[model samples]
Target: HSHGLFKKLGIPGPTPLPFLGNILSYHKGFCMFDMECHKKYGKVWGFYDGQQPVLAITDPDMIKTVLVKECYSVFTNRRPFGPVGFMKSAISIAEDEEWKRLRSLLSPTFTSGKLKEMVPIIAQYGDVLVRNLRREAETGKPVTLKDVFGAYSMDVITSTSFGVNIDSLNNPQDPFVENDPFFLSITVFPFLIPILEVLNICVFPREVTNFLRKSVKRMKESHRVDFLQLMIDSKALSDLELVAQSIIFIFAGYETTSSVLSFIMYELATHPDVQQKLQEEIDAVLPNKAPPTYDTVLQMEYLDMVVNETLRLFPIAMRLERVCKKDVEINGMFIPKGVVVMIPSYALHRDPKYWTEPEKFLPERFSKKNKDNIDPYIYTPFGSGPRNCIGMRFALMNMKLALIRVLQNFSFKPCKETQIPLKLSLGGLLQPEKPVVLKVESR
Candidate 1:
């Protein structure tokens, strides 16, 4: 399967040239590729990735077959990068039996039962966020909601994942700033760092590894019963193994949840009607109550809808890429091994074919009637299939808890500084390009 894949797959794409394939076309910005492919090639398209044949499939049934029925064979390994080279064997990069075993061992920690017990801890972090924002509002200064939410999420995940209090919510500085030299290097240039590490071009800074190694040791010595403890007690892991696993959770759990909260708040600020409806739902459920509880938070149906809509619009993990492992026939087209399949959840969620008024912030579209009418795969913020985000439950719990506190105490309106039509930050996971400023008034 070479660059002739376009003709073989009955798809339209530019001619492949030498080792560069159609790379120049991509660089020239020929229609965000993912969204534009379907328009030109119908449900499936063929392209060249540096002389390698690549196929793009958007048909829902085909997607299901690739992701669900043949996941292990097709999506065995994720596309590799080396920014955090020190994280070579983390769950994200691990494949086959090793990946399965690691996932199974850690899966229990994120189960619904485990999450229910951790609700109070999640709420405590949420309280810290609300209190901090209230303090910021008193100054009448524009606050970076994403930055603040990131800190809050980091604190919560740090406590749960490491059984250590980094106090990031109150302290703006990096929790591991002094101990981890790679903190700034990796944070500033995440993609490059991992690639460099994987190529063995650079080693993970010794100080960073040492700090995490020491933290795990100390926690184990003290019998801390958090995520690290769970990994250690599981009997099949070593110290280094435990550290890698804990580090993945720390990064994944917090960053994704924070992005969700940031996007949700940004949407609410921009869409006042959705914001007011969400506030009304919260008011109806909590109703003059001071400090809303978990029960009250669950009763806010519209709030959940708001969160879902926000995810649809700004999914934290914008795209998912899977590698085909075996020959597969889909939609009368043959897909072979080693081809990388990219799923544009962000683009698909906004696809006009699936969503009516897709660009608008309408939470009611998630209502039972509207939801039933649309294809389920059209909106996959958490992704679909077994290999989807493992900590989806944990992430949602933290997000809802944070929103409950905000809804109880404040009414949000877009400030003049807030960016309209929201520019997406292409560099990082998924984040708004600018700070979303909101006028927060105490209720």
Candidate 2:
């Protein structure tokens, strides 16, 4: 009976099966499925996420309306997934006033002044990363980038967020890194999760949360100057809130940031021409081979272009979803209350309607002369509007510092094990289906 939801609205979309809705179609993976749907259905389409009506909007005007203009007033919270335990307190999933207060409290931790102080701390890990990679490069073996960057990201997160220096690069099996909550372990089939919950199935281990809480509690007592300390000092969040926020910082920052760094390396490895051009720019920018300053790294226009292009090619967020708070009409499209509206960033980034040669990895598309022509909403790596990624600057700086350090000392080449046309994971964050293996050469 509800199969006519789209038909009633006269909106086009991929056909959904009963009960399961569009879940079966996701076998092709979310990114690829989204691409196919967008090609067939155009800008505005209706889909079902396990019977929950979702309005997938790619039109720049409507996207701007939903994400920018009415983001706070109407589409204030993300798609509500029922009671996710400690995760509910996380800033990413917190709704309305709680989200607002958390954002305000956490915003100061990533300011320019705060991040500038983290420069040396991040650079120190970069040095260790180079040294670690140097060993692997000398062995003349293809290094799995996810493992390598994973360690680096873990080290950076632990040190910067917890104010503790755990050298994950040196100790591969370090308990902290080994047991770190891998967010991917949790499956996200919203409708099916209720059954799993009834069965007493815990996707995430309780021990890990306990470990994190104990660790964070110890750090909180230290009163050190770090992100966690700042939050602790604020005295706004309770112990539970503090633990939830701690887990989220690790959950959000660690793997996602590493995956982004790894993908950039993969693109550079396969596209030697672009790699050489970027290297030349890196050379010119850091002629003396000094550690990059916040300002110095900003001047590497080509580096910025390369980063933007990689993000354009593989948006980690995949989809930016906002649940409507009220019924509204935008650009003649009617959206009712409680419906999930998604901006499929991965699909939109490569949509031919908005991008030229969408399949190619052309950094020049993001060049100063060309970028002005591109719509910001169409290429949202960090998302758009007021609720965009708060740690965008921190992630950007972290990636650039590592790239500068690595490119200054070494170069990446395609290894025998490297996947030419990378096979990505099915849903959620953008990740390679297999370990991304690349050969590193001393510069």
Candidate 3:
């Protein structure tokens, strides 16, 4: 495993151990490990996962090569998480033909018009979110925004797409709440995948699958078309494909939106000046206290800046990867087909060459005047290239509605319990190690 070809190949990095490779070397945390790699090693360097070679890339042009310009033909798949067939039906983990088909079938689910229809629905959940926040506010109790946000997003995901909607926040025993996340299968260990799949053989209870079928049938009858219904009508994927796609929607769409929203809420709570500026923008458009229309949120200049800056500062997608499908040449280096290629977004976002005072929370950096100065490839939170997040508009609609409505009547403030400086933790997704507690000071 530690054959040391990286040096012979002219790439430099820490010497990998025989079998474990770099896995246990930086045991502190994944983020810490990645941070140190870029700090110690140059832009292009080598690491390993057991026997497999891993190239951690910080070079913009190389990343461009890996993700664009017919990159998909060579790097269409991610580094294998498990076996070849593991989660193969899910688009995010799919490759070649399966991915092409899913991308085609799923892209229309989150179109601008469909997302506009989902906004009022998102607004309704926002109403529920605010109602819950106020309840906590009245008690002078700070709330964990992620859990609260998760419950809210859960309602949105389930009602708008999944068959049913239930408030998982207040009622922990709700059917969906008990099985709340339902996306955990996305993060099983490689060796344990077969076992995990065996256990999930029935996947959900027999009743839930039956319920999903019935729900889709009802939607087709009622002329109420949504994400699941569109997939069913498309006649392109199987029942398992439908289940896998639905699972990926929740897996990919749910937590990432919640994580960014969590950080944005924290940023708003901690930075009152920025919060006030953002509030002013929202207030100007909805002064009549009208629920924000989908288009109006898009019209918001400052809100867009805030979101962009927040994405830059605390991008939930910290690392991006594209596995080389065939031998490719970049500059003078020959990237062997099997090695993993990765981009460290966390390090890239903070690099001084690309950003001034990169650690500071500055929304104006993304304002019209300064945004053009930023490189599109370097600032990708949802990612760049043709394979960028398909649910981009859908997630935007969900986040903007929640933020506008939540902040309209309530201001976030750091309470005595607030985590002064958040401790970053990488789980199935990256999030605060501690509870993101903040006082919801009612306006």
Candidate 4:
């Protein structure tokens, strides 16, 4: 057998062992895999997974070719870790024809028009978040911004996904918030996935799947006027299939958006100048509003910058991976079929080649003039191409409305507990390691 890409490309990599697949040197404590690889072997590097070849692609042009031009063949199906596949539906997991049909059926639900209808719901939840934080501030207790944001996102997803008002923000002790069995299973038993995958076993709990099944059943029974109903009415899915999709929407939709908001709030609290500029933009656009309308919230340009810059530094989904389906040549490198190609969003966003002073938290970098200077694909938080996030418009609307309410009433200052350079959680999506505590005073 020929030497793998590492030796073929003159790239250095950790010696691959039996089953573990270079798990030692490459796995840094809670840091991203691609970043660690880049540190060890310049921009482009290759490693072996036992005998399977893997290439770390950090260049923007290479990323475009893998994710855009060859997207259908390369990302036809997502190979998830552990029991990740159990929770995913056609949107995040299915391949080829299945993905195509599912994408077509669900596309209209996340359109700008449908998202506009959901703006009122988004604003309402944002108000709840501000009110709860205000209460905590009044009681002289610092709010765990990350937890609060998580619950806020949960409420938004619940409303749009199930047409139910979970009200997680107001009642943190709500069953949905406190007693999420699937979340409990995933959190407490993180290793359950790798074990099942190794044994070629389907370990997803039937009861967990049934819970979502019942949620969709309840939505259909009520004939709710929401996206879930659209999925149900389309007659394109069974109850179990609908549950799989809903479970994905509920989990994937909220987590990333919530994490980004937590990071943005933390950065804004620490960098008062950025906060002031964002507030100025908010005030100028939306003055003394109980609830800002979608039109009003969308007009805040600097707020957009704040979110963009936060995403630049701390993207919730730090990396995007695709498995090569066909032999393709990139930058004089021949990547064979079944080889995994990684586009490290974190690395790309912070690359000096793409952005000047990449480490600095500069919102001005995303301004119209400077935004043009950078490559569009290099700065994607929601990803790019046809397989890009379907919920992009909805996610941004929720973030904008939430931040508008937050800045309108309260000012924030970072607490000592907040980490410098911010530590991301070890697994799953990226999240701040500790409670991003801040002094929240009424404006």
Candidate 5:
């Protein structure tokens, strides 16, 4: 053997069989399995997801050390997103120096000046969404805000990515937004997932790739300050690199912004007091139906707190992974090189030790007055360290614009059809098991 696995002394986990490891422990709902292990095994434990051995860490200090690379650059790489070669270069899955360059190139795209270019687009589409929601409220009918926000989010992503604007709320059945992939990957076959991901295909089809190609090809000659134009103007990347970024922007940017806004909407809907407090802050800051400019939204303290609380309650990524580049000792555990480090954010965010009344919808916990008491490692929703979400600024821009305008025009109420005490799905994200329906009325 090239190396001995799990050289760390006395690390234990749910027992595994040879070769297959812990793959069969639970065919579905691995998050439940993970939670059970944390309860029974405490902070540091081990498990094999198929052929790989991973350390499941819950302690905040250990997690912080693993994520912050200045002290130890050995853990610099993200766990590979796909085993397929092309998938390696996407920023979420990129490694080492190349990843650094890509980040540097894209950083300018999200600056205050550049992001200001998107505020008008966000406010314009946000206004349309409010008008459309007003129509539904006039009927006094319930609407699935998830789908509602998805359509709006799709508009925002496409509008900024390639500068192609469309009113998706009026045209709800968007090809890219609603279509599922034609691939058959609903199995546990080894390496099947990587092949699906690398081939530029997956859970959803990439017909959008073709859409992005033609759209960006047209934008290359324009003076537009959209993402495609910015990257092209930067002159640090190739056309294919630009296309690769667009693919990720569509997947990461669209998925994250949509789900986050949905959770925020749901939380505000269920908690009227929290909703009113958020509105009070919005009105006092903007007053008289003023536009939610990028600066204004960024300045609103309650908006930031509400978004933080929503992410604390329901984060986009449930589990995070990092690979050790060199063997090292952490609090007496001798971690071997090439071993995987698993950080379970879902388990940590709700830990009662780090948060008070962890199950309630309390935005005040994130207020500046109380924030200093919490450690950075204790509340990582976008994650920590150099590889935190690249599109954080852009995603926040999309969410704040939508939430500010939506709340300004309408109030969300729970309908008879609204599911109470909702159960989460077992997929990559802990999504609701059913459609999130709510009552909407013009304020």
Candidate 6:
């Protein structure tokens, strides 16, 4: 009977079902569901993720109002997930003063100078990736891009975050790989969070959390130049904060980069024209085949465009969500306190109103000449706000390094197993339902 909340408020949206709310409609996956909703309901619409009310806003101006204009005053925090182990203190979920403190203390570590110094460190994994993929190419079989990229990401994250290296590419039984499935076993249903928490269920299993906690405790004494060392040297975070942040680094740093790299490879493989253009640019940048420097990668304009375009097509987080900090009216829409505001990033990126040939993968859309026309709010792969992804620069640099090294020695082609018009899986992240298989051929 109360399903008329959107009607009562004069907001438009799909009708919600009792108890289950609108979650069942997400059977097509959140990315597709959001795209459909945005098409049918326009910019501002109401949704219910199990009893919780969510306001999906796609209008660029309205987005700017929520994420920027009234950010600190009205939308200071994301939807609370309640207390869930050490994640409660993780910077992503930390609120108010704790959030500010963590953000402030950690911001300096990813500065341009610091990132420049880590180029060689990141490129080392790139070298290893080349060798690993070369072996895969020799097999003359379709390569599962996700598996290779996952291992590379694992190796990169561990080396940079823990100051220790494990070649997860070759070692399938490595603790990181062996325990990964457990770490990624996060529940997608919002309403079940509290129930699961009370039942003592956690996103990160207790065993995995304990392993990370112990690892952080033991490595607190590292003198190396890495994220862990920088955090330790800051002397800002407590022991628990250290553990929590380390967990966050591992969680955020690994999967997102890997997923994006896999998709980038898939796109390049399918679009031979785009691949040829990018390779020409990459060759011009590194003609002598020297390892990619921080400056050189930044100089490769076409590579940057391809990467940006891929991100637009497949953002890791399908939606940027925040909880209303207080009751507020924006553009005369009454958004009560505690209602979640969701910006459908995937839908916005592909919205026909904002993009020309939205479904087509056109790297030129992000070229230097054309990119100026894009609104930051609509194309936000890393999000747009004071609280956007803190690891944006680092992720970009790492991604460029991997792509540079691989493209230098090899080119990708679509194999028989390649899934064109990929079917995305249902999850918190944007992922393909099937393995992204492509042919790895020496250029």
What does each candidate score in C-alpha RMSD? 4.3, 2.9, 3.6, 4.0, 3.2, 2.7
Cα lDDT tens digits, model 4, 1-443, are 33345676676765565443454443353235666667777778776544456677777778888778878766555444445445545467777777777788888888777777888877778888887888887887567886778888888888878667867866766546342234334433445767765664544543455555665554477634567866765736666566677776776767777778888898898899988888887887776655688787677788888888988998777767787777778666787777777677887777777778888888998788887787877887888877788888888888888888988888998777667767776644577666578788887
When 2 and 3 are scored with lDDT, the better candidate is 2
Candidate 4 deviates by what RMSD? 4.0
Q: lDDT of model 1 at residue 335?
A: 72
Worst 10 residues of 4 by lDDT: 179-188
Give the better candidate number (4 or 6) by lDDT.
6
lDDT of each: 0.71, 0.82, 0.76, 0.73, 0.75, 0.83
Please give, for residues 82-191, the per-residue lDDT of candidate 6 as tens digits.
43865788888988777888989889888999999888888998999999999999988989988889899998888888768778878777646455133212223454
Candidate whose lDDT is highest = 6
lDDT against true structure, model 6: 0.83
Off by over 4 Å in 2: 179-202, 222-224, 427-429
Q: Count clashing pairs, candidate 3.
A: 0
Residue 417, candidate 4: Cα error in Å is 2.6
Instruction: Output the worst ten-in-a-row residue range by lDDT, candidate 5.
Output: 180-189
User: What is candidate 3's lDDT per residue for 19-70, written digit by digit as tens?
Assistant: 6566665455556777788888867888876666788888777778777864
* Each prediction's TM-score versus the true structure: 0.88, 0.93, 0.90, 0.89, 0.90, 0.94
Residue 357 error for model 2, in Å?
1.1
lDDT (tens digit, per residue) of candidate 2 on 317-344: 8999999899899888888887889999
Winner on lDDT between 1 and 4 is 4
Pairs that collide, model 5: none
Clashes of 1: 6
Compared with the true structure, what per-residue lDDT tens digits does model 5 show for residues 1-443? 21125433577687766655666665556567777778788888887765667788888778878887432376777655333444455776667788888888888888878888878977888988887788878987899877778888888877788767787878656544554012112232346776676676644344545655676666586555577778877736777777777777888876678778878888888999989888888888889878888789889988999999988877778777888888788765678877788887777778877888878889999888998998888688878887777777778778998899998878888989877776667555667777688998877
Indicate which candidate wins on TM-score: 6
User: Which is the winner by lDDT between candidate 1 and candidate 6?
Assistant: 6
Local error of candidate 5 at residue 4 (angstroms): 9.1
* Per-residue lDDT of 416 in model 2: 73
**Best first by lDDT, ranked:** 6, 2, 3, 5, 4, 1
